[PDB]
Amino acid sequence: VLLEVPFSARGDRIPDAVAELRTREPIRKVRTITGAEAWLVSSYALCTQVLEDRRFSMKETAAAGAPRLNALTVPPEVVNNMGNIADAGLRKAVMKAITPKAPGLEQFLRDTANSLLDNLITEGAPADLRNDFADPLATALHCKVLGIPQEDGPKLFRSLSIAFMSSADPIPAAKINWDRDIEYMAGILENPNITTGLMGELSRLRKDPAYSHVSDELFATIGVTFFGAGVISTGSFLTTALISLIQRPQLRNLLHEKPELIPAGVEELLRINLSFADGLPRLATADIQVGDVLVRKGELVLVLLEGANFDPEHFPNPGSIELDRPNPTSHLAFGRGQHFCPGSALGRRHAQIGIEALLKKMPGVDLAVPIDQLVWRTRFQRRIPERLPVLW
Ligand code: HEM
């Protein structure tokens, strides 16, 4: 019987099995939720090998009849979204619009984190740091980044509990939501009041006849895809980083006292983060040797990020947060190679600012329920608790 993936929906603790698997079988046959076979890769060396070799293709994971990690929740072409962006001549533009350096942006993040936190302090403990802090901070950020009205955020957010499912079967709601969100974005592109952020930029490139080969659909897809990827990734990461920090009171206290180390703290929280529920999928486009396995053309490979990130061969004392590591950014939390996360800078600043605000307003933050009372979302592309009850 094949080892089934994923092993655990819990985002607070790495299963003991990962260390077992990594040492003895850093590439191992598994079965996914669709019933497909796959190669799960779990050492830093093999994970990096896979991500650095472009013949392990992201685009081709959408190929018809390919073994699948999970059901598509987007059109097959949209799996190649970053490639379409590059081909449309929109790459450095997209990347420029999603940098945290934008005028006023970091102060907006800061003031938004502090306002959310003041509201929670007024309502009284317990507070839910996912639904009433991390996710709203993520959503407010991405509305600003995209240049769309803040009041439009909640509804785009609504789609995400389905869009980012990791399902054995197709999801009818995913298509309905996708089509509505695409239509919304299309409308944003023609709205002359939208002059800032990613959509403001994309909108004026759309008016340019030099971009006449670029469909309206792709422009709109970029907005929907970046909003969703950024909101789900930042909100989910911050949420489970807060659990990591809460469980390490002396770290909490150290960062509160020495906020200059908060970036180093966040980098370690990224390294040990369990937010990705599944390995990153790739399809082999050739026969390629990975460890003791010849991966065959057409086979699915899953790059287990926490495999690499907890690998003591690369990170000594891997379960420990150490702020003085010599190569602290070398984890795979943002991936590697061709598909390295284009939002990584913004991801770091969202978490840095969110944590700094929280530590200053709630220096005594702690869980308000036993950790085993958290409800872990299942069959989802991220590991998150439904609610994160705290007191302070
Ligand atoms: C802590 C926050 C974040 C984490 C941990 C994270 C993680 C990742 C990872 C691991 C990948 C690589 C996927 C792969 O190679 O298969 C990725 C790619 C991606 N991320 Fe992020 N991400 C974060 C924030 C963001 C933000 C803020 C945005 C946009 C606003 C974003 C947009 C994207 C997009 C569009 C891709 C696909 C790139 C491609 O296909 O080439 N992410 N992210």
Swiss-Prot record:
It catalyses: cyclo(L-tyrosyl-L-tyrosyl) + 2 reduced [2Fe-2S]-[ferredoxin] + O2 + 2 H(+) = mycoclysin + 2 oxidized [2Fe-2S]-[ferredoxin] + 2 H2O. Its EC number is 1.14.19.70. GO terms for molecular function: heme binding; iron ion binding; monooxygenase activity; oxidoreductase activity, acting on paired donors, with incorporation or reduction of molecular oxygen. It is an enzyme of class 1 (oxidoreductase). The record marks P342 as: Important for the position of heme. Pfam families: p450. The keyword Glycoprotein does not apply. This is Mycocyclosin synthase. It is found in: Cytoplasm. Keywords: Cytoplasm, Heme, Iron, Metal-binding, Monooxygenase, Oxidoreductase. Belongs to the cytochrome P450 family. It comes from Mycobacterium tuberculosis (strain CDC 1551 / Oshkosh).
